[PDB]
From a paper:
Bacteria are under constant threat of invasion by bacteriophages (phages) and other mobile genetic elements (MGEs). Among the many protection strategies employed against these invaders, the highly diverse CRISPR-Cas systems stand out as the only known adaptive immune systems in bacteria.
Here, we report the first structure of an Aca protein, the Aca2 DNA-binding transcriptional autorepressor from Pectobacterium carotovorum bacteriophage ZF40, determined to 1.34 Å. Aca2 presents a conserved N-terminal helix-turn-helix DNA-binding domain and a previously uncharacterized C-terminal dimerization domain. The elution volume during the final size exclusion chromatography run indicated that the 13.7 kDa Aca2 protein forms a dimer in solution, corroborating what was observed with our previous constructs. The Aca2 dimer structure shows each protomer stacked against one another in opposition, like the letter X, such that the HTH motifs are aligned along the “base” of the dimer. Examining a single protomer shows that the proposed NTD HTH and relative C-terminal domain (CTD) are in fact small clusters of secondary structure elements abutting and joined by a longer backbone α-helix, α4, such that the protomer forms a single globular protein. Whilst the NTD provides the HTH motif for DNA-binding, the CTD stabilizes the positioning of the NTD from the other protomer by stacking α6 against the other protomer α1, thereby aiding dimerization. The Aca2 protomer-protomer interface was analyzed using PDBsum, which calculated a buried surface area of 1213 Å2. This is supported by two salt bridges formed between R57 within α4 of protomer A and E110 within α6 of protomer B, and vice versa. Whilst the upper CTD surface of the dimer contains mixed patches of both electropositive and electronegative potential, the NTD HTH motif is clearly electropositive and primed for DNA binding (left). Dimerization positions the Aca2 recognition helices for insertion into the major grooves of target DNA, supporting its role in regulating anti-CRISPRs.
Author numbering:
A (entry chain A), B (entry chain B): 2 to 116
């Protein structure tokens, strides 16, 4: 539904324009129409957003591994996209947002430091 | 630091303009300055952001209570601010975003449905 689509997008920290370009391959206006509720949300886009959410879960699982190993992780929080891309040259703006989503969660809940 | 400030802000699903107006009581430019890293984040702003994160934890704890009572919660995802305000007339735009952040988490991670 429109509500599930927006929920996942925001949890993954994607701006509408970023989700539209990279996941929907549609204009931002088209993506807004999907989230507005005045349109059918196509099921394929919803499925691709759930696939991307599984990437966030994989990234969380890796941090959980460090925690089980006794480490208090120091996670890079990239305020600047360009710095993320410099350190992660095989990723893009969507990877940057997923990194923010994961680092912010672990920090805010008291489980990791940000660097 | 600027990284912690932006991380909490984004996790709570607040736009810069919303955080600036209601939490900082400053302009978006000033809030962006605090998120830039150029100087230290003010003590009172830091504390208020931590306190709002605690409100989010309290909201999660209330849902955890319902799960422990055997409910499968149907959480209302408010894509429309005014609908949230009508249902929660003592709250404002910041409370709306907190509601989105909690509903999106429990939905995307499989514990609740959205309506």
């Amino acid at each position: 539904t429109n509500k599930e689509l927006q929920a996942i997008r925001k949890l993954l920290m994607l701006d509408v324009s970023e989700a539209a370009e990279h996941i929907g391959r549609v204009s931002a206006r088209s993506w807004q129409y999907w989230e507005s509720g005045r349109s059918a949300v196509p099921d394929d886009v919803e499925q691709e957003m759930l696939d991307l959410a599984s990437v966030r879960i994989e990234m969380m699982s890796a941090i959980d591994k460090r925690l089980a190993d006794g480490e208090r992780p120091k996670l890079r929080f990239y305020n600047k996209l360009d710095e993320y891309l410099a350190d992660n040259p095989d990723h893009n703006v969507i990877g940057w947002r997923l990194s923010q989503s994961v680092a912010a969660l672990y920090y805010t809940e008291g489980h990791a430091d940000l660097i």
